[PDB]
Amino acid sequence: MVSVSEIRKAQRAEGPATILAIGTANPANCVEQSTYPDFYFKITNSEHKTELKEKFQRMCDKSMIKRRYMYLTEEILKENPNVCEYMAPSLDARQDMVVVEVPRLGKEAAVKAIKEWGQPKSKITHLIVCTTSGVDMPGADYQLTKLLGLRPYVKRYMMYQQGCFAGGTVLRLAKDLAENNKGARVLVVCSEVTAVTFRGPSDTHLDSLVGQALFGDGAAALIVGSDPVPEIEKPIFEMVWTAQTIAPDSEGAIDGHLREAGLTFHLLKDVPGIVSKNITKALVEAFEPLGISDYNSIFWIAHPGGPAILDQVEQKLALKPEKMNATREVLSEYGNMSSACVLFILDEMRKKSTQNGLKTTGEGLEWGVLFGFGPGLTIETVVLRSVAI
Amino acid sequence: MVSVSEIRKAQRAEGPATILAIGTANPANCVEQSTYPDFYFKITNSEHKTELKEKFQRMCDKSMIKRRYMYLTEEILKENPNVCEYMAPSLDARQDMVVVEVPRLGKEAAVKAIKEWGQPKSKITHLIVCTTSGVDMPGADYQLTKLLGLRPYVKRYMMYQQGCFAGGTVLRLAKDLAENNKGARVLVVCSEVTAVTFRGPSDTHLDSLVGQALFGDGAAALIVGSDPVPEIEKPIFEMVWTAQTIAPDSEGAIDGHLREAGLTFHLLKDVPGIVSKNITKALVEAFEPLGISDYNSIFWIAHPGGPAILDQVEQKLALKPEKMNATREVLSEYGNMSSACVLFILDEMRKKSTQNGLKTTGEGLEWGVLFGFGPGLTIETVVLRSVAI
């Protein structure tokens, strides 16, 4: 009797997945980078590691980060000396921090996004929560459902232990959720807290120390939907195409293991080199079908895993230095916030473009690209179209 | 110049997401339930807990499980006394086990599914990996990509720390991936290994002890795609509609925390009672739009979290006892394999239906339902249609 083709036709959305709102949040503790080597070597009881402290000072001086927001404070760290050691049993203490803070911070960003969207939160049909800090059952998805008062029947996607590329992953996922389901409105929350990876310095693990110079905390929330209601909802960016790939010759480049001592961080290969060697292939896959090959003619969002990734991509492609402005502004003001960072850059770019009266949310350009980079080595690509004014 | 509506139209699939292959695998160590209380109390050095052992014997006798397959062996357990204690630091040892075994076991199931599907593995465009045992960066998704020789540009969905309902979650996710992307072929792998939750007995944590009577190991893999190539690919079941909800009055019913002592398991409420009180609402949401209200007139797959869930759902709805046959056969032969279990039941049901010359893969019936149950308390619903012969 019943027709599945009829059901399928009536069930799906029509237009491209669209970002309809963006909100962000960060812990209230603002930590200046200029003075961070002094603070960090003191709080970790490592002032006798003179050579190492000098290396960290250079790391921070070259990081192109002015400040970061951190859940961790001096007082919290003083109560948790095992977190301050380089490698001491501490996962239970770290989990207790982030199982609460990830959803708390995610809620602040989410409320802001929902306020901007302006529609009833009961119309949110899907929820994607993404983090690399902590895991729990029920997850942070359940917690944000409860904290926000979403409908119990929201469809949840709990993305745990994902890594720095997953700001692209959540867009790639939200696109299919929104596009295949008529009426669907996806709340997307990325919430990253460095309490699981903070640890003291060791001079035979300089890669771990790099993490301590770069990673900071933050959450970003989006509303994503197809078929926006004109004059009621307000498109910011459209998604058009996505990809994920694993770069050749990159095995072990970025790893992270969740252990009794917390989440470890390792870099075994040249990540700026691998990303810049492989970014052209990603761009030609994404844009040669759209007939575009001038990569200064698109707007850019790149996960700022560290400044050398950006410098080497700029140099490889001969990007004008201004292409990375929004990206570098977020790196400067917040550090590498893992999966949330790219979403902060989208917010920065559309806010500047509208405040400065440019013709589109994409710095006055039509087409744009968003890249996530992280363990794999994985590259996420999202092709974007801007919106006029 | 370029038309996003044109791109969107050309990009999407037409028909319902279809299961095209199912393969399963389990660790080679088969553990008989009849003798498990003796084995378990001895290996955990708990033979002096006489009262507790008697309770466990009853638990196992009432479990309706004949045997389970377990990665853990006597020899492994003898080398890991901290895993044998009720609560001892042991996550690093457990992670070392399951970061390897989850993808190893998942690969065996996946190879079988791909062999049944019969098409080139280079045509797999998306990969969903799901587990509740262990986490790592890069994840098990990366590992199975490498182990199977999938394309580096497979689009990956790493579902970690998900819990027992996520066999429905992965179907709910695969449906949108397949339906919104022309040509997409999704490899779905659920792989569950009880080495992260195994622990010794304690008489003030009878809920933890229940876990030790019920959970066993297994992996299941699917190929999911829309628009199957007739006479080349072979439909088994179609997905038509999905939902996820959180039962009222269930806060804290099933929890699990990942700690330095491994993954804990708690039951604070009556799970059979909550599921049976809420299963009718789920069925009417799923089937009243299809005009069906006779729940013996559909085929059934229910996550067998324990036999009392099944008994109480059967009694609530007045299911004929045969409705749960496939479900109970999997519980009997394999135990509760968390997210993978429902996929084993789909395999059992279609294999029996074809071996016994019934008219459809759904025991000769047209429409069916698949339920996942787990932390939340969460209920996943997937509405299925069978395939003729």
Curated annotation (Swiss-Prot), chains A, B:
What highest taxon heads this organism's lineage?
Answer: Eukaryota
Which positions bind CoA? K55, F56, Q57, R58, M59, C60, D61, K62, A308
Annotated phenotype, changing H303 to A/D/N/T: Drastically reduces catalytic efficiency
**Does the keyword field hold Acyltransferase?**
yes
Gene3D superfamilies noted in UniProt: 3.40.47.10
Q: How does it assemble?
A: Homodimer.
Q: Does the keyword Ribonucleoprotein apply?
A: no
- Which is one Pfam family of this protein? Chal_sti_synt_N
State where substrate binds.
Answer: T197, G216, D217
Supply the source organism for this entry.
Medicago sativa
EC number(s) stated in the UniProt entry for this protein = 2.3.1.74
Whichever gene encodes this chain, its name is CHS2
What pathway does this protein act in?
A: Secondary metabolite biosynthesis; flavonoid biosynthesis
Q: Which reaction does it catalyse?
A: (E)-4-coumaroyl-CoA + 3 malonyl-CoA + 3 H(+) = 2',4,4',6'-tetrahydroxychalcone + 3 CO2 + 4 CoA
Q: A GO term (biological process) for this protein?
A: polyketide biosynthetic process
The UniProt similarity line reads: Belongs to the thiolase-like superfamily. Chalcone/stilbene synthases family.
Q: What does this protein do?
A: The primary product of this enzyme is 4,2',4',6'-tetrahydroxychalcone (also termed naringenin-chalcone or chalcone) which can under specific conditions spontaneously isomerize into naringenin.
User: Any idea which GO molecular function terms this record carries?
Assistant: naringenin-chalcone synthase activity
Name assigned to this protein: Chalcone synthase 2
